[PDB]
Amino acid sequence: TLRAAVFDLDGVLALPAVFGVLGRTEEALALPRGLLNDAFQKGGPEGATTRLMKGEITLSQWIPLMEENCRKCSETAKVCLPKNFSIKEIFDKAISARKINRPMLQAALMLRKKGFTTAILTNTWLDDRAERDGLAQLMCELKMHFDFLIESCQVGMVKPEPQIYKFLLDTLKASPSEVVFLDDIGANLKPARDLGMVTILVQDTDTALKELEKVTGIQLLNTPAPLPTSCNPSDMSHGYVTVKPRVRLHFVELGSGPAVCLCHGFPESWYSWRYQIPALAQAGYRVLAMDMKGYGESSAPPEIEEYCMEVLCKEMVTFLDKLGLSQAVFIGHDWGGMLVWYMALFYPERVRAVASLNTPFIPANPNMSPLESIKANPVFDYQLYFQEPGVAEAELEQNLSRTFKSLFRASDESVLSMHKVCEAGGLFVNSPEEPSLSRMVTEEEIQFYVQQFKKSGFRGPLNWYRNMERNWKWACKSLGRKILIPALMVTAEKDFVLVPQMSQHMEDWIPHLKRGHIEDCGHWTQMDKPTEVNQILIKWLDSDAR
Amino acid sequence: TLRAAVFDLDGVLALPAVFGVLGRTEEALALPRGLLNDAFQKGGPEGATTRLMKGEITLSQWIPLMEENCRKCSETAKVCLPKNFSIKEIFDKAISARKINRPMLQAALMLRKKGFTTAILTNTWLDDRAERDGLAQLMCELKMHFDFLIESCQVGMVKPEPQIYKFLLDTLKASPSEVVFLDDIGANLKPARDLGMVTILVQDTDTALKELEKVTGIQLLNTPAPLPTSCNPSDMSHGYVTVKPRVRLHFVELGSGPAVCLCHGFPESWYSWRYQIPALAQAGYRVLAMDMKGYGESSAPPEIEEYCMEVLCKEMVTFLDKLGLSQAVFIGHDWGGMLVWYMALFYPERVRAVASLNTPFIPANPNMSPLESIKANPVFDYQLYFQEPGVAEAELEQNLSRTFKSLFRASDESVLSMHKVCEAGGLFVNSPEEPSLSRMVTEEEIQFYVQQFKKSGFRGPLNWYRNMERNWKWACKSLGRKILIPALMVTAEKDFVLVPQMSQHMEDWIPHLKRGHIEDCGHWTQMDKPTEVNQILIKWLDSDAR
Numbered sequence A, B: 001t002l003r004a005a006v007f008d009l010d011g012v013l014a015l016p017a018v019f020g021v022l023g024r025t026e027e028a029l030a031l032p033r034g035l036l037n038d039a040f041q042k043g044g045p046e047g048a049t050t051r052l053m054k055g056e057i058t059l060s061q062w063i064p065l066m067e068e069n070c071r072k073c074s075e076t077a078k079v080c081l082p083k084n085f086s087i088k089e090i091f092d093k094a095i096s097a098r099k100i101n102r103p104m105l106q107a108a109l110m111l112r113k114k115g116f117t118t119a120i121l122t123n124t125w126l127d128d129r130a131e132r133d134g135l136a137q138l139m140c141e142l143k144m145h146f147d148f149l150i151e152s153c154q155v156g157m158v159k160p161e162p163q164i165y166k167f168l169l170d171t172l173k174a175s176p177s178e179v180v181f182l183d184d185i186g187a188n189l190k191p192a193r194d195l196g197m198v199t200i201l202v203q204d205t206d207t208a209l210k211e212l213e214k215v216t217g218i219q220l221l222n223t224p225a226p227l228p229t230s231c232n233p234s235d236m237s238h239g240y241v242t243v244k245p246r247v248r249l250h251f252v253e254l255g256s257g258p259a260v261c262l263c264h265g266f267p268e269s270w271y272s273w274r275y276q277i278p279a280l281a282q283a284g285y286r287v288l289a290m291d292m293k294g295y296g297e298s299s300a301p302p303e304i305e306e307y308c309m310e311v312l313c314k315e316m317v318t319f320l321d322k323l324g325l326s327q328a329v330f331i332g333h334d335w336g337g338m339l340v341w342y343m344a345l346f347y348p349e350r351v352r353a354v355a356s357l358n359t360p361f362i363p364a365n366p367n368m369s370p371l372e373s374i375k376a377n378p379v380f381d382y383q384l385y386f387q388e389p390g391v392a393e394a395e396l397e398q399n400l401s402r403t404f405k406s407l408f409r410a411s412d413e414s415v416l417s418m419h420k421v422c423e424a425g426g427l428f429v430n431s432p433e434e435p436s437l438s439r440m441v442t443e444e445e446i447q448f449y450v451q452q453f454k455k456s457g458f459r460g461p462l463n464w465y466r467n468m469e470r471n472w473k474w475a476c477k478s479l480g481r482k483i484l485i486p487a488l489m490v491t492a493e494k495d496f497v498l499v500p501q502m503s504q505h506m507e508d509w510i511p512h513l514k515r516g517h518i519e520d521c522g523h524w525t526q527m528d529k530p531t532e533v534n535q536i537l538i539k540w541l542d543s544d545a546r
């Protein structure tokens, strides 16, 4: 029966409520109880505040009007306002104090996940204060999670006027009895109730969610910890830079602040960063999530040497040049991991900080041919299988769904071992035709990958593995250097190819190397443990790149 | 005969040179003359410095080696180094002191303009200092103006080793006698001379340019003041955001720092900002130059109401939401000018600062229908001509080259007056079939415009003029507000449509409004007076938006 849920901002989706600072300020300053709310409400429907909430005047216009009101209120209550009593101050402080009420957001999210139309309906104002950005950010962080945001100051109507509830129903395309409406203010619920909306009077959050749980029959309280926000590809800003005549790089871009360039591994996509993209943007960074050369909407020239580390690095440098970025933070995973270490060694002036997930930095051995090094580690056998052009392309392209469904598996689900792949004749020789779906990925998500790999297949991606010698030679040029810029290595307990122990000497080359470690995490780090990854990157960004 | 010109960085393209701070530091600290250069050069071809210049070690690795050398040099000269003598300090200071030598850059530019292949050939180092970004920026600002940048630390060779000059010739694809090579260091010229390169020993810049002028036969000294850097469309990062199902916005993006959203007028393009895009990026901003709805690579739905200010504004808001930008600076011209004032009035929380070129802010008159207002100003007659769908489309699309060549004219060249357009039957009824080229634009530039307007023609652009009433109604909602966020109005002396005097009451609505004014500037502000525009915007950004 219920199909829609409507939430207020102040006192429902964000806390403490601002009316609340009228009360607290009275107490703090020992003023007549209610003096500030009387001034706030003076004149009711024709008073300054209603005009503010209606969008007739801006916040800064309102501030001196509320001052006058307070003076008037205190004259009539035969009291004096403190020396330096300041509505600007009171409001600046209250507005920055209010934070998202996470459990209420999370309930709204969950309701939207079981198919509810969700909306924010709020009495709010046109905010032109020097400090307005703070509210702009909050509304940004909130509005993305909802089907509609209805703002009194944009629609010219206010709670509790009945016309806004009609406007509400009309925006929802629902009848009143299909709607639950939550609010901290009783008078504001009334007209919703009159229309036969289910209403919840929100005092403490948890009780309000209990009422909301009963009335919708969906679990909202004590629910397990949700995944971070993911990205919907067609809501992203998509960026394209031509770095040389046959080569254009695609990336997705979210946020403002220091530039952070995310470099995916084989055989993946910008979309492999879908859990980190909103989190890092939210954390105050400018995220650029690449399709690395070979993939997705980036170019995929066929020649092998187009994919040696050297060309790949120079290209990433050009990419910064064309965007006008003097540096970026480089974060990589798997192949992207190897690439960012090389960015650090060959272009430190361009790398603000460098971090790798899974991929250790290991210097080239100038005494041992790379092929030999590779044959001395049974778990790298899969790399010899990738050498012969065509062979792995045929297996990987034969059935894209099956490929990603077989590759993308959590540590407790695996169907392919990277062990004696050559001998077996292939990567999937002993895995099913139709693998089950990993817990890490939905069917929709696999199909995104499938669709990206239909543009270029696996030739470009596999070429990354086909420059062992050429990379080795270039890497030997760097054997005297150390990495002395800020650097983080994140190991993954259950990656059986890029094992933690392979990273164990890195401090010799990178003396101030910082570390993180994720337990019970397979090779597909970002999607296996997205919460831990986000937490580890943001803490490291904030302290080393900021 | 000469076809190529090669410049050094230190002491030729950037000044003061760093070797110079070895000398000055000696003097400042009263050390034995040359003590610091001896330490710098110790061991010659096998010494620390050569390894640095070759890329074997990074700058931070080198620093303690130079320390040791200085200690050794002072022991053998039987002197003591000062308490707190610090190579890190000396070098940090020297490296930030060095700035681009503008007249040398300008000579290189000019030579590239008459068809020379230009290159930077420099002995430089892998810079991993905490302060490395400073050098990264300089190299960024410089490298864009040259065909090649050859860095000793990237190629593994150094001046004066003869192999780097061979590598040079080979990169130039020129023979030695087609090349002029400039350098402040005599030993470094020698091998160029041996190959029969023309060489210039650069002491003071002006004398070096005199030699360079004589030997190339191109005027380089006392040349008139050049235009700012322009943008080549296919070197830009191109960005695309879907703001609603049928509507995607394109923009071009350059730089890092506070976001600055450039909104062009009718009938123009992101490319109308081509002179401001590098200048503002260079000035430390993140420039987003839109194709506004209707134009270029942005969508162009046919319906009139798709182009009322309200929809257009909401859309720009969504564009920020999807990019994860809580605010941007909005700068507009002509129609974009009107749009940014409305952004300021309806979404101040999203606008860091607002500036308009030419377009004044004028409140709607709630007593006079917009059509009437428009009929009361003979120079707005052209707007009535735009009303009837089809009419102006047919004239504007008939001959795209002729259209832009007739519109884009400096104040002293004009062929069309905006006066009695309806009566005459059209915009171009009394202008030539093949207008001459304005001094403001090359034939290449007109053709860019021509090509953009082949995608959608003029229906979307003209629709911007077709919502007089609808905009008027929405604007009336804002008649109580004032614009209290930072705001700049730039008037153009010789715009005969958006005249300066039309802006004269703006302080009533925008009390702290700041102004700039450009003399002898027609309607096409950014391309008419690009230098003055850049100077006025950067000064205003730096003080009001930063």
Ligand SMILES: N#Cc1cccnc1N1CCNCC1
Binding pocket: A265, A266, A267, A334, A335, A407, A416, A418, A497, A498, A523
């Ligand atoms: N293919 C693959 C693969 C499959 C499972 C685990 N790890 C894998 N790879 C990805 C490529 N880089 C090395 C590790």
Ligand SMILES: N#Cc1cccnc1N1CCNCC1
Binding pocket: B265, B266, B267, B334, B335, B407, B416, B418, B497, B498, B523
């Ligand atoms: N068309 C046009 C035109 C031509 C010359 C000068 N100004 C012009 N317009 C551009 C549109 N906005 C108003 C002014």
Ligand SMILES: [Mg+2]
Binding pocket: A008, A009, A010, A011, A017, A183, A184, A185
């Ligand atoms: Mg409330």
Ligand SMILES: [Mg+2]
Binding pocket: B008, B009, B010, B011, B017, B183, B184, B185
């Ligand atoms: Mg020099």
